[PDB]
Amino acid sequence: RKTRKESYAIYVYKVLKQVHPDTGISSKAMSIMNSFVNDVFERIAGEASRLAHYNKRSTITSREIQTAVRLLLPGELAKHAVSEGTKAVTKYTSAK
Amino acid sequence: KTRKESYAIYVYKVLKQVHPDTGISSKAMSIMNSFVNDVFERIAGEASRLAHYNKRSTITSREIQTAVRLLLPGELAKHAVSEGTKAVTKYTSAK
Amino acid sequence: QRLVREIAQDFKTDLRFQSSAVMALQEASEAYLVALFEDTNLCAIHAKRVTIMPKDIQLARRIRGERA
Amino acid sequence: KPHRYRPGTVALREIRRYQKSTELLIRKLPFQRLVREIAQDFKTDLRFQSSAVMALQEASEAYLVALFEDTNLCAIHAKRVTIMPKDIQLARRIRGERA
Amino acid sequence: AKAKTRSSRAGLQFPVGRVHRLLRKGNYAERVGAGAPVYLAAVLEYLTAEILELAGNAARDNKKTRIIPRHLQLAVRNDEELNKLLGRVTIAQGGVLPNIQSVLLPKC
Amino acid sequence: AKAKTRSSRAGLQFPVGRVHRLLRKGNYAERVGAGAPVYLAAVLEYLTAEILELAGNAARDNKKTRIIPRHLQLAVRNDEELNKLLGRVTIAQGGVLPNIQSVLLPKC
Amino acid sequence: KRHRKVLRDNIQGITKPAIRRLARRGGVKRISGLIYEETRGVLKVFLENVIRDAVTYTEHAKRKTVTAMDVVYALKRQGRTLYGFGG
Amino acid sequence: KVLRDNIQGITKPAIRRLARRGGVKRISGLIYEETRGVLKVFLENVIRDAVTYTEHAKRKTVTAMDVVYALKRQGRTLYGFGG
After folding, report:
1. Which residue positions does N6-methyllysine occur at (chain H)?
2. How near does any CA of chain H get to the CA of B35, in Å?
3. Chain D nearest CA to G30, separation (Å)
């Protein structure tokens, strides 16, 4: 009883309810989400890093990712995704 | 002003070491100045990841050497590895 | 499982293989093979044939660039 | 009365010439005008830095040439000599950009 | 003093508190603007939500209540747009899309 | 006192001084072992010397004594071993290797 | 002047012989007349893909001019790295 | 009667099945050979890297994550087995 693992199993499970309150989720599939969402998280993070390096800014802020997400996502998703962050920031900023 | 770094002189220096006579144009010089960069992160890339991959917090020559086999294919691996092994022991000999 | 053990013996000696790591090679190879198969048809149908021959699978692996 | 080369007899000559040569082939002026035209949509009144434009030319021809040589092979694979668009679709398909 | 999770403060579900630590140890930068992760976590929740919506409809067709990768591979491949995000990913036991070239079919 | 070049210390042409600077600034890791930059500097010298010799050789073989990119492309594409490393990148004013498909040849 | 720009028909700036010469470097012997239209679209199709992200770099940098250093950057992301302009 | 190269352990019908999943209708006999060689080639690269991470970690046992890492290198990511 040691070496606790870290994953996103709880989180993906919760959001599943909001879209399909009935649907059940297989265990082995849950690995794929625990893998897939990890795959994206590094793909963006490295992409954001180089932009700061290109512009010599010693920091990564919401601006960089906003441009960054405007690169990886092909076309349509970005505007919703960009919109998604903007509203999310506004609520956070309002209740910072 | 506007001091800018490169690797022009070093490219020139080794050129003589193999060919002390032949000349080079400034355009092709930039390509090496570009190319010498291009490899540098690519090897630095796999080198970086392996450290976290073994949860190692420091990059060392041992880490580099395996990365050499990964990136460069064919005989250049054992060739350059021999060079690298030869190079380091020379420096440690004069550390 | 025999095949992987045989080939791996060339690169190094005495490799105990974790059971979970095994089935991965099939799936990765399977999809790679499956993907390498479908496009071969497009090469085949392009010449108005229906049957695939190895000269096509060679051509297909070139266009991807992997043949070189 | 005047001599005429046979069909394709001329054509192969430029092949030999152009692969030996290493200069650009597109007319310089229109290409700079076209990139300005397309780029206008993403952003108004941008200024193209003079050195930047030919880089797009260099890559484009390099990218373009790679297409035709690849589309060339399948035509032979199709036992043909002349390329028609269906080949390029196939070549673009296999690499994985059109699809 | 009492503490509240940041994920709630953004009205989000994904772990902003956790993912912020990841970039800190990810060595992508030496300093991270505090606004960046909150933006980031929001993106993922949108992305993840987009796919199982498609997956859930597939599970309806086969009537199974439990979601399965065969759904997942099927869902993310029919959408041409999402296809481009994962053009070079292969799913475990996914299976190919049901497709047959027209010429292969009988003439009538 | 009496400082000396680390590149000279190993007898290397490439600057060991500047390369180790980049690794600290490159954020590739949080600490850098001493031996690694020496090894890295060594291999690069092998690579550039390898390619330069072929280019300088071939240009001389073409009765020319100034290296230009057309020479440079010829060396890379003619050696498959290097062609693997540089299969992706194309060089400005590189020019294509002289090649014609056999079937394209005249009928006689 | 200080207004308006050339924004029409520039896709025809690539005149028929220009492609014909380009294809010669590819070694194709004989070409039918139909292929001219497709490549213009194909060339364009590839093109804005290069510009679009290239534009994105500039706006993040808050410039107005498009530098070559940005052009190669996007070309790296798409995959086709270019030697001879920066690095 | 199984003592030989295990490449022939890849039975011909198994190939015939895979061609079906790719939608291949008709297969010539000569395909069965290069498919062996082509597949053979594919293993050579992946294990070489797969071996490399293991021995770098000094481990004598090839583990699952080592596989996906090498597969990620060839531009073919593998969802489902870690990371």
Report:
1. 1
2. 21
3. 5
